[PDB]
Symmetry: D2
Subunit: 357 residues, 4 copies
């Protein structure tokens, strides 16, 4: 027949991201998921910060945001339990008390600095009212190279899926999968390990069966897309919701129910080569988040990747309260931070004890 010489990269099986950061990516990821450690998510937007401060009456300025972050980041000792921090863009450039930038300070202290690189939720337009896509791919490589150069070595991008009426449009499932897979690839290209966050939200009256049905489908499509875009599985992480009943469903699950539904869902879709899952805690209480993670790490189902946390409110809530926005609340604020971080560090080892909370 008529044969032609072509590049192998023009062939379907050869669409694979080739990145010279490869080995570095793989090493960051193992660092991120070290045993007894997890990630502190501290990438609240300026607005989310208003919310955060609201109950303590703290005014919403750059300086105060800095302080709210320093509260945790300069909590010496937290490094034993937190392996990386997802910063907000503003924090990357702020200075730690030593005068190093935050990324510089954390690296020195042994904590990998990451950055939230998505540009926020927007209406999906296709599919059903209430569904949302996420923006931020334009100019992405240039931002990401700039964060790398600032010292970040991982990034995070969140897509959400709102269950309504027991289901989600296939439009959001596909489109958001496609966005996450693109983001992953480009992150790896620029040297940052991508945290792929496909959050099936806890919002609504749905139950845990509905949650599992939608998550399993959403997440397999995210996987199919990562394959289709060529991701380095060994240099990537997942940040999924746990499978639980909906926030307004009226029902609460035990942690052992949670860990089984979650882990059996994940084991159906996530390749064992992905090094770790850093669960989001969205809507759960600080205690539940620890109890639920702990059960995961005690679940008899297959779970070949590390199962750890990537939490924001569930690690900060009480701290924020005790801190009060004042220098004077600083110590108590930390004590509380440390305790929650320790709880969760044990829960990753599967040794947390509720009597201890």
């Amino acid at each position: 027949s008529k044969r032609v010489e072509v590049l192998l990269t023009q062939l379907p099986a050869y669409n694979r991201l080739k990145t010279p950061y490869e080995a570095e990516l793989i090493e960051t990821a193992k660092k991120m998921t070290a045993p007894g450690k997890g990630l502190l998510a501290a990438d609240e937007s300026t607005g989310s910060c208003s919310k955060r401060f609201a109950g303590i009456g703290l005014s919403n300025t750059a300086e105060h945001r800095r302080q709210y972050r320093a509260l945790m980041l300069e909590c010496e000792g937290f490094e034993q339990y937190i392996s990386g921090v997802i910063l907000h863009d503003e924090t990357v450039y702020q200075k730690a008390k030593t005068g190093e930038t935050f990324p510089q300070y954390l690296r020195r202290r042994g904590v990998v600095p990451g950055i939230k690189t998505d540009c926020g939720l927007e209406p999906l337009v296709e599919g059903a009212k209430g569904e949302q896509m996420t923006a931020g791919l334009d100019g992405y490589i240039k931002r990401a190279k700039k964060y790398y150069a600032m010292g970040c070595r991982f990034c995070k991008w969140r897509n959400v899926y709102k269950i309504q009426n027991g289901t989600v449009s296939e439009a959001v499932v596909r489109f958001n999968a496609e966005t996450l897979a693109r983001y992953a690839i480009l992150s790896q290209l620029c040297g940052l390990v991508p945290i792929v966050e496909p959050e099936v939200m806890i919002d609504g009256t749905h139950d845990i069966e509905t949650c599992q049905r939608v998550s399993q489908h959403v997440w397999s499509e995210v996987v199919s897309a990562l394959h289709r875009h060529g991701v380095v599985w060994e240099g990537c992480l997942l940040k999924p919701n746990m499978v639980v009943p909906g926030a307004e469903s009226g029902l609460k699950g035990h942690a052992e129910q949670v860990a089984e539904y979650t882990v059996k869902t994940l084991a159906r879709v996530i390749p064992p080569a992905l090094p770790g899952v850093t669960f989001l805690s969205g809507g759960l209480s600080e205690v539940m988040a620890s109890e639920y993670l702990n059960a995961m790490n005690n679940c008899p189902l297959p779970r070949p990747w590390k199962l750890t946390f990537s939490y924001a409110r569930a690690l900060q809530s009480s701290a924020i309260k005790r801190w009060g926005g004042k220098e004077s609340g600083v110590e108590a604020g930390r004590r509380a931070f440390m305790h929650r971080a320790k709880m969760n560090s044990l829960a990753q080892l599967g040794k947390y004890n509720r009597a201890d909370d």
Copy 2:
């Protein structure tokens, strides 16, 4: 069985763009493709303008860009042959000699003003070296609403596909289809008729058979994606390349060969409900572009949509030359513009005569 009440928009067959500009979109499009008329593409970037001016020694300033556009846009009389102009963002805000903005002036004169809304080509990263995606979806609705408000009623977004080694990666085929279909939807949502331009480039040594094989595949995937995103076919247009031998292939086709390969390719993939195809002229001479369009409009194959032009260099080249960047070349510059615009207007009627060029 277990039944549940859901929104119809959560169902697969209901992912259809619902836009209150619908009827307006449909009417613009028919206006754009009126018999004996075509579109002037005048959306060169600032840089492309350097190129354009290079041979006449015209310096590259905003003022001179304005003049280069006014050369054509204020060429009274051109309105008989041009139904719409694809402006560059800068031109939207510049003023015509009457002091109306350009969009305002053209509308008054009967010419629909459109706007190039993509953000330019960038490396695809996936697929093979040399392939390119197009940026610009972020912030798109807000830009588009702003152009609408300025009077534009259509927009244009170009994706390209570089044939190398006889083929193109399936990665570029899919990804660029996906980008075009998203852009289409959002354009319609904001009131602008989208020109979907999936250009299989003339660049390379490939021949016309290779061109047809790749275009047919690229374009069916663009269609499948438009269906999958929910486009209003009746409010959309296509701006494809013609199917011709590659620029460095060494071969030149007759116009009748061209029109048959082109039209038989399109008739295999484009739904008859899409109102019109406004061919790009990329790489063809000014004469060829007219001869080739003319043959299309004389082709016995099925061609239910309007077949017209959407040309830039092939309508401006000579004009630019005769104009010379000087007030003094103005009249000759126009004469030439008018003549090429008239040639092409006849070629859309299938009555162009080469003896006349």
Copy 3:
């Protein structure tokens, strides 16, 4: 880069059915869709025949089936209005009154003989209760070559889609599209023009809007699949339902409503290169079927392919009744057949007159 020489057929854009019957396929199809002609579907299974005979008390034997077919097929003169007959496998081998096989007799008389080659409906298993796939791909090439050798030059394969609750599973949409596209390809390979029948059934209480929403989606997916399998559009035909309200919806549409919804649906999805659509009449009365086709051929929307009929009950019903299963009803049976065939022949020209029925 690393380049490799491969077959062009290993590349995505080169998966195109290459069939030496190509030109013959194209010619059959134009024959099938000649102006003022349509297809008689006479491919009832043995069982369907029980039904057919039930009201006339005709016993269900091979001999009687033969006679029931001969009633129409040896109705000299019907050749003016019918261009091809879809036979059942049994009929292919039966003999006409001249002693030629039926295929031989029809060809001699100017009627292209086709054959129903699917193996019947079966439970889809995936998707929702009530949905159905169609069997018959195994051993297909050998059957098809055998029909060709017997003189058939086209074939027919029917898939169905049952609307329930306003919708259909995406599973049936995809799977049945995939089956139709495979069948098409293989038919063409063996020399038979494939009639692709994706019937959205009239069954249920749905309305005409629901019908249009599901048909448009079902049919675009059938098209995407035909492209994906490589079909010769110019050597293929479509046999879709008309878009009408559901049989138990309680509403009846005018013919002009029907033709607009139908033709605007088709014009959104079917490539203009497919030579013709031979509508099925499933559930409509004999009169409605003619009135509805007539309106199609009077519809101002785009409709580049031939729009004709491929009917069974709506051409046989009355005939069967008048014939009565007796030699003695033969003449009246034919008269009635002829009249319905003439009605429909005019309706294809867009000149049918109801005053005439």
Copy 4:
């Protein structure tokens, strides 16, 4: 908005095979993959049997086929190392020496009886010359229910992918994935655990890198399809090739290279919930097949499912030779069978020792 009540099975995330054999499937599979055990594939067709007998001069009759099977199946003691036997259809109905059917005899002896249910390879028609699809879906449920009723509790279906020129068409990749996923679903529905065999063949001059690139792509598409059809991962098994250099490449890999490429490939695509992989040995020597499996079970990469064998020639070759087609070779034939089965049983434990072969 307009809401409608639909079946949940009409929604995308609900296309999941619901089978009342579920728990039984899961239990068979764990039985099949018990530690230190593997499957004997004895499903050679009548023709393959000619080949098999050729070198020993054994005539090719049903009786002799029976004897060739009895050689292994009535090799008392083999039950310690073999957990299930893939029979050929003919063997299902033949009788063991006790007068039980083979399935009955094996079950009694503790060996799960399975059945090869595909109908053989055929030309793909689409894609490139040399590629092949597999037939057998028509009438599948009725066959499968009949095997179940005969006592089989698992089945096997093989698809192949021929690397040529370094690659494979995307057509074969997709189509064969689609066939395997359909087969899986239907098998589970009828009570038989499906062995999904997507064999990337060892045939050709390709190297091990090419093998890994194609297998990874072929196998992820098989997975995506299994998800898309709704398979019960926990009740399914995989029978893939190992990743090795091509048979005519001129290079031989060490077993440790093999196990790393294989396991790292699988860990990128196969969900950890699939209970086990039963490798095929196609083209490898009897020794290599054991050494290669052993290394797998010694590989430090992630490998959450059982890694065992499903071998035919590599367990029978020598035996067949020693047996000689004669009663008289019977004992030596068994000795050899036992030894190879023991080798492989140890290799599944990762304790095989080559000094022992």
